[PDB]
Design a protein around this ligand. Sequence first.
Ligand SMILES: O=c1c(O)c(-c2cc(O)c(O)c(O)c2)oc2cc(O)cc(O)c12
Ligand SMILES: O=c1c(O)c(-c2cc(O)c(O)c(O)c2)oc2cc(O)cc(O)c12
Ligand SMILES: [Cl-]
Ligand SMILES: [Cl-]
Ligand SMILES: [Cl-]
Ligand SMILES: [Cl-]
Ligand SMILES: [Cl-]
Ligand SMILES: [Cl-]
Ligand SMILES: [Cl-]
Ligand SMILES: [Cl-]
Lengths: 114, 114, 114
Amino acid sequence: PMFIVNTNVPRASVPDGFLSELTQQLAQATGKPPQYIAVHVVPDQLMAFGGSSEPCALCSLHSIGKIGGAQNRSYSKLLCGLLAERLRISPDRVYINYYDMNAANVGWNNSTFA
Amino acid sequence: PMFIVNTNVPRASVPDGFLSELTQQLAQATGKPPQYIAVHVVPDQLMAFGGSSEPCALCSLHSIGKIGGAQNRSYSKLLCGLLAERLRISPDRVYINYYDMNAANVGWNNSTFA
Amino acid sequence: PMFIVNTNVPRASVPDGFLSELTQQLAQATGKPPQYIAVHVVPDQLMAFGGSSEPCALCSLHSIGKIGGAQNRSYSKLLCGLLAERLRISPDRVYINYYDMNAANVGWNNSTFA
Ligand SMILES: O=c1c(O)c(-c2cc(O)c(O)c(O)c2)oc2cc(O)cc(O)c12
Ligand SMILES: O=c1c(O)c(-c2cc(O)c(O)c(O)c2)oc2cc(O)cc(O)c12
Ligand SMILES: [Cl-]
Ligand SMILES: [Cl-]
Ligand SMILES: [Cl-]
Ligand SMILES: [Cl-]
Ligand SMILES: [Cl-]
Ligand SMILES: [Cl-]
Ligand SMILES: [Cl-]
Ligand SMILES: [Cl-]
C-alpha cells in the first residue's frame, strides 16, 4: 500500500519519526503487511487550500482492497489526526484521495500482484 | 476539487498570484465554491514531453462530479490557456488527467464527503 | 502516456540520458509513439518502503489503453530492470501503479483525446 502527503509545511516542521509512525498506523489500519507499506512526505510545497496558503495537505492512499465507505471514513480520521498532531495542519485543510487498486494494476518486484 | 501542475519551468517564472488565479478560474469553471478548491504548483521539475525538455506540464484535476466529455474539453482549453499565458508553456506540451471522484473516496476534515 | 518515478535516490545518482531512455523504452513497450510519452523523475524524496529509507521508488504509468494484466507484468519487469540498473533500486522496493485512462479524461493542446 502507498500513502503520499504533499504539504506546504516546511521540512524542518516534519518531526523525527514521521515516516515510521505513518508506516505503523497505516499497516494497522489497512491490515496490510507493515514491511510493505510505502509512505512519501513532500514538504515545502507551493500550494493553496481555498485560496489560502495556511498549512494544508493533499494526500492519496492506494491499496489493493480495504477501501470503502466506512473504512475511508476511519482512515480520514486517523490520517487527519496525525497531520494535525505532527504537522499542525487543520483537518478541514486536508484532502485524501482513496484508490482501490486492482491487483493487476500494481507493479512490484518485476511483476504485478495479480 | 484538487488541481496539480508539475512543470520544469523555474519557480521564478511562476508569477505571483498564480495560485489565486488558478483557484478563481477553477471555482468559476467547475462551479464549485473556491473554498473547496485546492491547487498545487510544482516548478523546477526534471521532466520530458516527447523526449524534449522544453517547458511542459503534467497536470491532474480531481473533482466530485463536474467531470465529463464536454466539461473536460472546456477545462483543457481554460487550463492550457493559463499555462500558456502565465508559464509560457505551449498547449501541445501539456497533459491534464481528469478524475471524477466518488464522494466516498475523498477524505476531508476527519471523514469523507459520502 | 505519462510515467512518473518518485525516489529517495539523490539527483546526482540519476545518469545522463535517463529521461530519454525511459521515453524510448516506454514507447517501445506501450507501442505509443515516443512523441506522446511524458516522463517525470523526482529524486531526493523523503520516502520509506516498509519503514526503511533504503533506495526505493514509487511510480505511476497513465496510458489511454495498452494497460492490462499481461502488459502491466511486462511493464513492471521492464521498469524495475531500468530502476535497478540505472538507479540501483532493488525491484522489491518499487511500486508502479497502472492507469488505463479514458480518452475523454486526458486533456492536451486545449482539448481532450475523446
Ligand atoms: O501489498 C500487498 C497486498 O496488497 C497483498 C494483497 C494482494 C491482493 O491482491 C489481495 O486481494 C489482498 O487481499 C492482499 O498481497 C501482498 C503480498 C506480499 O508478499 C507483499 C505485499 O506488499 C502484498
Ligand atoms: O469539495 C467539496 C465537494 O466536491 C462538494 C460536493 C460533494 C459531493 O459529493 C457532491 O455530489 C457535490 O455536488 C458537491 O461538497 C463539499 C462540501 C464542503 O463543506 C466542503 C467541500 O470541500 C466540498
Ligand atoms: Cl468499507
Ligand atoms: Cl485499478
Ligand atoms: Cl471535489
Ligand atoms: Cl473514485
Ligand atoms: Cl496515452
Ligand atoms: Cl551517456
Ligand atoms: Cl494485457
Ligand atoms: Cl479514466
